């Protein structure tokens, strides 16, 4: 009986507030930093077109076994062929059309399978595809793809993830002499509990497809989550550094909540932004075939 965590804040900025992402995130910060994650719905007219080279988009997804940690004790696809596989998997698993499966049912079934010792569900995830390989999901004035006059406002938009500031201030940067990543998801494909490198911000955009479910923990409960992890994670991974342990830190949010860790959830739909604040532990899974883009900013 999985209990859905409370909903994270959702913001619907007007066209005035939507003029600058960094200004908007700083003003919603007093609330969103207390929940770890937040969702931002752009104005209804803001619809960036999909600019990925779909004709050339090929990738080999990684294999995910949902119950790999509880059990302790691949084809190359195009975007079309992966989606046909993703839709056939979900429609066969739930025995109904893909768009008719309630998001609460996929959520309850995902967490049952993760801890299931009898059912071994295996899915695939097109994870960590660089935007340099086939182009960003957003229009970019890089001269390698045709940008129409109606699309130029999106190539120059501050909410275009390619236009987010990524350079961190340091003395090393002045003594010296990032790009968004793409995620093609299917039903039950997931990412486990982790924080971004250098406790960085991260913004995620779902270009199209089925929703992506998120779980977020505010930064003021980061040490409590890490303590709960060490107490409940397998002992063979107890001594591993964070950069490696984060690869195998899948945990039911109700287990964290039972130990007093505040967890917030949300369903990121197509065309919606999710922002993760510094040192906000987050995890989640995809409701079905979708396409997401994410970048770290500061
Ligand atoms: C956390 C490890 C993890 O579960 N995986 C599998 C899932 C895909 N992938 C991801 C995904 C992700 N965010 C989800 C975005 C989305 O899927 O839309 N963040 C990272 C990451 C890794 C190191 C440092 C910072 N971030 N890696 C690779 C490792
Ligand atoms: Mn990440």
Tokens standing for residue 59: 């990738």
Residue 282 CA, ligand 2 centroid: distance in Å: 8
Residue minimizing CA distance to atom 7 of ligand 1: 191
| Ligand 1 atom index nearest CA of 195 | 25
Q: Is the dihedral of CA 146, 150, 155, 156 positive or negative?
A: positive
Residue 294 CA, ligand 1 centroid: distance in Å: 10
Distances 138 to 40, 52, 154, 231, 282 between C-alpha atoms, Å: 17, 8, 7, 42, 24
Residue 251: helix, strand or coil by DSSP? Answer: coil
Residues touching ligand 1 (Cβ under 6 Å) are 125, 127-128, 183, 191-192, 194, 196-197, 204, 212, 246-247, 292, 294
Q: Using alpha carbons, select from 268, 167, 153, 256 the residue that is nearest to residue 208.
A: 268
Neighbours of 169 (CB within 10 A): 8
Give start and end residues of each alpha helix (H) in 211-276.
222-232, 242-245, 253-258
Ligand with an atom nearest the CA of residue 293: 1
d(CA 152, CA 130): 22
Is 194 annotated to bind a ligand? Reply is yes
Is 99 annotated to bind a ligand? Reply is no
Residue 194 CA, ligand 2 centroid: distance in Å: 7
Contact in structure between 188 and 123 (CB atoms under 8 Å): yes
d(CA 102, CA 94): 10
β-pairing verdict for 10-11 and 37-40? parallel
Q: Using alpha carbons, select from 19, 45, 50 the residue that is nearest to residue 205.
A: 50
Is 196 annotated to bind a ligand? Reply is yes
Is 146 annotated to bind a ligand? Reply is no
Residue 162 CA, ligand 1 centroid: distance in Å: 19
d(CA 222, CA 146): 44
Tokens standing for residue 111: 């967490």
Contact in structure between 159 and 42 (CB atoms under 8 Å): yes
DSSP 54-111: TTT-EE-PEEEETTTTGGG----EEHHHHHHHHHHHHHHHHTS-GGGS-HHHHHHHHH
Residue 284: helix, strand or coil by DSSP? Answer: strand
Q: What share of the chain is helix, strand, coil (3-state, %, to 5)?
A: 35, 25, 45
The method of structure determination was X-ray
Q: How far apart are the first and last CA of the chain?
A: 39
Q: Give Cβ neighbours of residue 93 (< 8 Å, ≥ 6 apart).
A: 121, 187
d(CA 48, CA 251): 35
Domains of the chain: 1-298 (2.60.120.650)
Residue 205 CA, ligand 1 centroid: distance in Å: 14
Instruction: Give the resolution to one decimal, in Å.
Output: 1.9
């Amino acid at each position: 009986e999985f209990v859905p965590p409370p909903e994270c804040p959702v913001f619907e900025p007007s066209w005035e507030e939507f003029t600058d992402p960094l200004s908007f995130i700083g003003r919603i910060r007093p609330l969103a930093e207390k929940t770890g994650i937040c969702k931002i719905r752009p104005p209804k007219d803001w619809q960036p077109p999909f600019a990925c080279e779909v004709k050339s988009f090929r990738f080999t997804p990684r294999v995910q076994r949902l119950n790999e940690l509880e059990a302790m004790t691949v084809r190359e696809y195009t975007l079309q062929s992966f989606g046909e596989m993703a839709d056939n998997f979900k429609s066969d698993y739930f025995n109904m059309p893909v768009h008719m499966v309630p998001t609460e049912l996929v959520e309850k079934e995902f967490w049952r399978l993760v801890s299931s010792i009898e059912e071994d569900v295996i899915v695939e995830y097109g994870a960590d595809i660089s935007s340099k390989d086939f182009g960003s999901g957003f229009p970019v004035k890089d001269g390698r793809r045709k940008i129409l006059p109606e699309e130029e406002e999106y190539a120059l938009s501050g909410w275009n993830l390619n236009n987010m500031p990524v350079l961190e201030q340091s003395v090393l940067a002045h003594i010296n002499v990032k790009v968004p990543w793409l995620y093609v998801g299917m039903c039950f494909s997931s990412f486990c509990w982790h924080i971004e490198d250098h406790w960085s911000y991260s913004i995620n955009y779902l270009h199209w497809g089925e929703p992506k479910t998120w779980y977020g923990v505010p930064s003021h409960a980061a040490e409590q989550l890490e303590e709960v992890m060490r107490e409940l994670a397998p002992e063979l991974f107890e001594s591993q550094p964070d950069l490696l342990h984060q690869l195998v830190t899948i945990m039911n949010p109700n287990v964290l909540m039972e130990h007093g860790v505040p967890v917030y959830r949300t369903n990121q739909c197509a065309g919606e932004f999710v922002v993760t604040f510094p040192r906000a532990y987050h995890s989640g899974f995809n409701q079905g075939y979708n396409f997401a883009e994410a970048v770290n900013f500061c």
